[PDB]
Each structure stands twice: as C-alpha cells, then as structure tokens.
Amino acid sequence: FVEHARKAGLVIPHERLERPIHLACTAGIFDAYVPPEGDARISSLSKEGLAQRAERLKKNVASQLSIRKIRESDPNFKIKDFPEKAKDIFIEAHLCLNNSDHDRLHTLVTENCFPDMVWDIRYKTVRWSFVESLEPPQVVQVRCSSLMNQGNIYGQVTVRMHTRQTLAIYDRFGRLMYGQEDVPRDVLEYVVFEKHLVDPYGSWRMHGKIIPPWAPPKQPILKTVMIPGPQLKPWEEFEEPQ
Amino acid sequence: SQLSPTELIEMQNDLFNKEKNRQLSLTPRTEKIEVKHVGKTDPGTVFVMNKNISTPYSCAMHLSEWYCRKSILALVDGQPWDMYKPLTKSCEIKFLTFKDDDPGEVNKAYWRSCAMMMGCVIERAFKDEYVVSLVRAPEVPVIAGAFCYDVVLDKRLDEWMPTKENLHSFTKDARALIYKDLPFETLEVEAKVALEIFQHNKYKLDFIEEKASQNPERIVKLHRFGDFIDVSEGPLIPRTSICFQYEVSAVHNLQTQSSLVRRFQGLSLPVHLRAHFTIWNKLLERSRKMVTEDK
C-alpha cells in the first residue's frame, strides 16, 4: 500500500542527518551479461565454451578498462586467480547457511546477497552439499562504477559456474519440503561478486545470483497449492477471459 | 486345485496390490499437473497438483469440508470421475451433488455402488459347503423401485427360497458393512491381468471379455473396497458412509435353460436425502415386485 495522509498528520520534516549514510555495498548489478542460449549444449564441448569465454575475455574493451582500474588501484591483481577464490566463497557461504552462522556470512556475501537468502530460509533446516564443479569456473565480465560524490569505485566480477549440488530443506517441524539430499542435482549458476576500491580494507563479496531466461525449470514441490481467484463482493459478478 | 475361502481373497488382494505397485512404479516422480474450477462457487480457481497421485477429492480439501462431505461425483470434462481416482492430464473440474439440477449421473453412480455392497453381503454369508457365483450387476434405471444383483447358487441348494429371517440377516450384515467405514478404490487393468483375478467365475471371465472387447484397448475397470473386488460400468460413490437406510427386500428365482439366476432386489437412500418412516414403508412395498430391465 502506497499511502500518505497529508490532510491530518502533515509530512515528516526535512532533516539533515549529521552522519552521511555509509554503504558497504550497492544493490544494483550494473550490467547483466546476456549468455548464449545454446550454452546448455555448447558446454558438452569444453574447448568450445571455454574458448568463447576466453575470447570475449580478451576482446572486450569495457571489461579490460575496468580490469585496468582494479589493477591500478589494487596492485598484485590477477584475473586468473579470481574464479578460484570466488568459487571458494560459495563452498564457504552455502556451508554458512547450512550451519546457520550469520557472523561469517556477513564477511562473505554482500549487503544485498544477505537479506534474501537469510530472510526466507530462517525458520527451517537447510542442508546443502557441493560434490562436483564440472566445468572450470570462468570470469565472464568486469564492471566499474564511478561514484562522483564519494570518489568511490565498485568492482563487479561475474563468474559463471557449472556445479553439482545436493539440497535438502526440512520444514520447521522436521519434514522435508523442497528436495532430496541423496540426488546429486545438476546446477548452472550465473554469479556476480563485488569489491569496494577506495576502501582501505579490500573486501571481495558475493553480490548476486543471476538466472538466465532459458534456465531449466526447478524441481517440483511436494505439497499441493491452491490459487484463489479474484474475490467477489455481493453485487460483483465473475467475468472469465479466454 | 483345492482352495480355502480366505486364501482366494488374499490372492485377489495380492494381485490388486501388485497392480497398484506396477501403476505407481511408472516413475512419474511428482510431475506438476494443473486443474481449474469451472464450478459456480469459486470460478477462476487454480490447483497445482501431483499427476496420477492427487485426486479430485484431494482438490476439495482445499476449499472446505462442505465439498469434501457433499460431493459424490466429479465432472471432469466429458467424464464423471469418482473422488478417489488419481488424475491424468491437465483438467477442468466441477463438483456434483445430490441436490443439483441434473443429479442423474450421480444417481446411476449410486445404484452401481449400492449394488456392489450387496455382493459382499451375499458371498460371505454362505456355508463353506455351498458355492456362490456372482454373475453381473444389471443396471436398472432409478424409476424402477430397486437395485438388483444376479447370483447363481449350488445345485442342491436350489430348491429352497429365502425366509424373512434370512432376508433380515442380509439387511443386518449390509448395515454392519456400512457401520465400519469403507473407502472405494478404482484401478485400470488389462484384460490379461484382469482375467487372472476372477478366474473361477466363468460369468465374470466372459463379461470381462465382452466389456473389454467393445473398447479397443482391452481395458477392464476394477473397483475394490475392503476385501471385495468387482468389475462395473462407470464411477462409484466415495465412501460407504453415505448410504443410510439399507434393505434387502425381495429375492426372485429366474430360470433360463442352462442357468438358474436369482435376482436380489433392495432399496437404499443417502444420509442427505433420508426419508420419513412412512414413506420408507411405501417404497419398501414397491421393491418387492420382480423388476426387469436387462436390455
């Protein structure tokens, strides 16, 4: 509901807050790399998929420019090292949700990654397992944000990863809901990680999880769902479209 | 081949259970199927259910107890379904009741159900020394005042005709059957696996033959409740509870050349429609006549 009662209670007066708000992260992902639609099949040939990835890594001028900003601002910087540590961040952060430890979960994931994953999951028991990463993790894209006001620069590194995972969600009474723990399900994930540059303490965080438009449908739920139709008041008749 | 009464029952149930396991082992692994409510109460209502597991009854549990208790038969597209039959492909469901304007579909589904019950009443009520062969469940229209089942009995047992004591005992065991609550279950069998369950009844085996012959895939429709299994035309009512007043009224000896076939005629009303003690005597009068529509 978007409502303001202007008639009676006025409007909250305009205040100058003596602390300018400090943000470790910024919600938006600047540019979403739109992946090739045949990448389900193209992945069967590794020297094709990884060739296209590496090719578009070398060829992009925007990506190279952001790479240059991160490399000048933060010396001892390698992009061949990144998809390894970025893949480590997963095995750590998913284990963090498994164990429901939010302390270490604040170090890894970004301000924007945290609220969703913690919010909807919090009253249940979640067990997750990383068995195989089938295709070696590739850095697809890099982006740099120039904040003119703060002088702040934000690096964003996309990692695409093929993965094999087992997920079991027990509901708050202990009974299963989403998935079996004994099936090594095949999962492909688009990921974005973030970094604050002007920041003296050099933080690299998981920012967001991107899903392609042609992404395979997820596993079917156990319980039956009932979707109620539009509610009819006393004099309002029902109308049915074709 | 020598067989005990309880052995044959068990064997039939084992065949039926093997059937069920084989139907469920098709490995659907919970595929999502979609149902829509075309009924007049909550139109534009969607249900996401589990193909070949979830039932139109399980679809009523989402609305209210009122549907669960009132609805006898589901109208899905151009077919009546019975509440406990799992659903196949995406459907559109309307619920039928006894007070609806064209209850006829339900009515036919009542007599069929009601008739089947009287099978259990009879076969199990006879001495181990004799033999009871159930024949068919002849479908009379509702304006005729009874429901009828056909039965052949042991040749030495063929001279005596029943006493009001015996009749009343039939009625009593019928009501005792209604007392404990029995669900009705529907299974689809191939003629090959269906002919193995019935066996010793030749009329069952032949009826199966004709019935499965007229429909190209050789499909037999089986209905199981408790320890009893029977093949019938069309759907059945969801629970035994729904039947309130039960009577085995008359039994009539009919004789063809090569067979002696007894009709068992009875009358019953649903707990919803239940009628007064005077009216019941009036209809229990009309159910005494021999009622013939076979064709």
Side-chain angles (χ1 to χ4, degrees):
Chain A
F1 300 93
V2 174
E3 287 184 19
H4 62 290
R6 215 167 154 198
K7 323 176 187 181
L10 208 66
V11 160
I12 304 183
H14 304 286
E15 303 177 356
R16 293 186 191 181
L17 299 180
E18 298 191 357
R19 309 177 178 188
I21 299 177
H22 193 71
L23 298 180
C25 303
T26 164
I29 312 178
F30 317 134
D31 284 305
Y33 162 81
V34 180
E37 302 77 6
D39 196 29
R41 309 175 178 185
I42 297 180
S43 69
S44 56
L45 338 136
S46 189
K47 191 39 201 166
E48 290 300 335
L50 299 193
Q52 298 172 19
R53 301 302 169 184
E55 276 178 19
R56 302 183 185 184
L57 266 184
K58 303 172 184 175
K59 287 181 181 182
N60 294 322
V61 181
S63 97
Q64 277 188 10
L65 277 181
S66 55
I67 289 168
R68 280 173 190 176
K69 286 193 176 182
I70 312 174
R71 247 176 172 113
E72 292 171 8
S73 304
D74 302 328
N76 192 14
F77 187 65
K78 301 183 182 182
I79 320 257
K80 298 200 175 183
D81 299 347
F82 196 90
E84 197 70 7
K85 303 161 188 174
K87 177 191 163 182
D88 203 340
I89 287 190
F90 265 79
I91 300 189
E92 286 191 14
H94 279 295
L95 271 183
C96 237
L97 274 181
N98 288 341
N99 197 25
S100 58
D101 183 337
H102 300 187
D103 308 323
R104 196 197 199 191
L105 194 50
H106 278 301
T107 65
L108 300 173
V109 314
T110 214
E111 300 303 333
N112 191 23
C113 207
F114 192 80
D116 315 337
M117 63 164 69
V118 173
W119 201 247
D120 306 323
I121 217 172
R122 65 185 176 189
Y123 273 107
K124 309 160 182 190
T125 306
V126 166
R127 304 185 173 177
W128 160 102
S129 282
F130 196 99
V131 42
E132 298 161 354
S133 63
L134 296 174
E135 198 165 359
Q138 288 280 353
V139 167
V140 174
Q141 150 149 84
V142 181
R143 293 297 188 186
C144 265
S145 165
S146 54
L147 293 192
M148 198 56 69
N149 304 320
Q150 308 176 347
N152 271 359
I153 331 181
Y154 291 89
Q156 283 192 346
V157 175
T158 283
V159 180
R160 160 243 180 172
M161 52 187 68
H162 200 103
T163 304
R164 220 167 168 90
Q165 284 171 355
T166 89
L167 168 69
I169 308 189
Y170 303 91
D171 196 278
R172 71 166 292 211
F173 302 101
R175 41 181 175 175
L176 205 69
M177 181 168 38
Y178 185 67
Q180 318 154 12
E181 208 162 357
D182 221 336
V183 48
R185 177 87 168 187
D186 299 341
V187 204
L188 174 73
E189 317 281 25
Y190 184 115
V191 200
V192 180
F193 302 70
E194 202 198 348
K195 162 100 165 189
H196 199 309
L197 292 192
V198 189
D199 190 326
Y201 287 96
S203 329
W204 269 108
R205 298 176 174 185
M206 249 203 71
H207 196 73
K209 171 176 158 174
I210 311 193
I211 291 173
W214 72 92
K218 307 189 170 182
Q219 274 189 6
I221 324 298
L222 291 189
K223 80 187 175 205
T224 311
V225 153
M226 193 259 294
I227 309 162
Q231 185 70 4
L232 298 182
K233 55 179 174 181
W235 64 86
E236 187 184 11
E237 295 189 10
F238 197 82
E239 191 177 1
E240 327 197 336
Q242 290 185 359
Chain B
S1 63
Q2 295 179 10
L3 313 149
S4 297
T6 315
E7 287 189 4
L8 291 190
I9 300 175
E10 286 299 331
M11 181 206 64
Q12 295 169 5
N13 291 330
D14 296 333
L15 290 178
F16 210 82
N17 293 328
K18 288 176 192 172
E19 299 297 343
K20 295 188 195 174
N21 298 334
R22 196 178 190 179
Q23 318 294 332
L24 302 183
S25 70
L26 284 186
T27 330
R29 290 183 186 176
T30 317
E31 187 200 357
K32 280 311 187 181
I33 188 186
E34 280 206 12
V35 179
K36 188 177 191 177
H37 193 244
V38 206
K40 202 189 176 169
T41 296
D42 295 330
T45 302
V46 202
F47 296 82
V48 184
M49 319 206 59
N50 299 327
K51 165 175 180 175
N52 213 23
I53 279 296
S54 309
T55 56
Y57 181 86
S58 159
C59 188
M61 308 253 72
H62 285 195
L63 292 194
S64 78
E65 192 175 2
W66 299 106
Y67 288 81
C68 162
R69 295 203 163 193
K70 292 204 172 189
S71 299
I72 273 56
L73 217 54
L75 195 47
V76 179
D77 329 323
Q79 313 284 358
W81 285 74
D82 64 317
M83 297 288 103
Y84 291 80
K85 215 164 153 187
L87 301 183
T88 59
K89 64 177 164 189
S90 184
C91 285
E92 297 186 9
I93 289 188
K94 177 191 171 184
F95 291 97
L96 299 175
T97 324
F98 278 113
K99 297 174 178 178
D100 205 334
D101 268 347
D102 333 283
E105 301 288 351
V106 172
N107 288 341
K108 299 180 174 186
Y110 196 71
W111 277 152
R112 296 162 175 179
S113 283
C114 188
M116 191 160 118
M117 315 185 49
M118 209 173 45
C120 245
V121 181
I122 293 179
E123 189 181 1
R124 322 208 160 187
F126 275 89
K127 186 165 202 167
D128 317 336
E129 307 182 357
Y130 307 100
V131 180
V132 183
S133 301
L134 304 187
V135 179
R136 57 185 182 193
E139 293 181 11
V140 282
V142 201
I143 280 176
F147 65 91
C148 318
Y149 201 85
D150 298 330
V151 167
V152 175
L153 293 189
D154 197 318
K155 287 303 177 181
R156 62 179 192 177
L157 189 76
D158 283 341
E159 281 302 332
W160 73 271
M161 295 276 84
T163 316
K164 305 170 186 177
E165 309 290 351
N166 302 126
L167 284 174
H168 186 90
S169 287
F170 286 121
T171 298
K172 186 159 191 179
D173 285 331
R175 291 177 189 169
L177 183 71
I178 296 190
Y179 193 77
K180 59 179 180 180
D181 198 358
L182 327 142
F184 287 103
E185 189 179 353
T186 293
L187 187 84
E188 307 297 345
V189 198
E190 184 62 19
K192 291 172 182 173
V193 247
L195 285 173
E196 284 190 5
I197 305 189
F198 279 101
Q199 274 174 13
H200 321 290
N201 304 324
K202 303 191 170 184
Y203 315 96
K204 293 301 181 181
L205 293 192
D206 298 323
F207 197 94
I208 285 178
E209 186 69 24
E210 307 166 352
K211 182 63 189 174
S213 70
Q214 70 194 8
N215 294 121
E217 306 79 14
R218 284 289 172 181
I219 301 187
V220 180
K221 191 164 190 172
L222 278 195
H223 296 283
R224 171 203 191 179
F225 87 92
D227 317 315
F228 193 79
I229 303 180
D230 182 22
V231 41
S232 78
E233 299 75 11
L236 296 190
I237 80 179
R239 286 260 174 179
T240 307
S241 301
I242 317 182
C243 230
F244 191 96
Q245 300 157 26
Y246 209 96
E247 293 288 14
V248 178
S249 167
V251 1
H252 303 305
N253 240 359
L254 189 78
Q255 54 183 8
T256 331
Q257 44 174 31
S258 52
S259 56
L260 304 174
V261 172
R262 333 184 177 215
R263 239 170 184 163
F264 277 81
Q265 308 217 355
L267 186 60
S268 52
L269 276 177
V271 312
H272 305 159
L273 285 181
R274 63 177 179 210
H276 177 70
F277 183 87
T278 292
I279 306 297
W280 188 237
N281 259 156
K282 304 295 186 165
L283 307 173
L284 214 54
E285 288 156 22
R286 203 214 175 189
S287 57
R288 309 275 181 188
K289 311 171 180 183
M290 308 192 41
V291 172
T292 62
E293 317 269 338
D294 272 344
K295 230 163 177 177

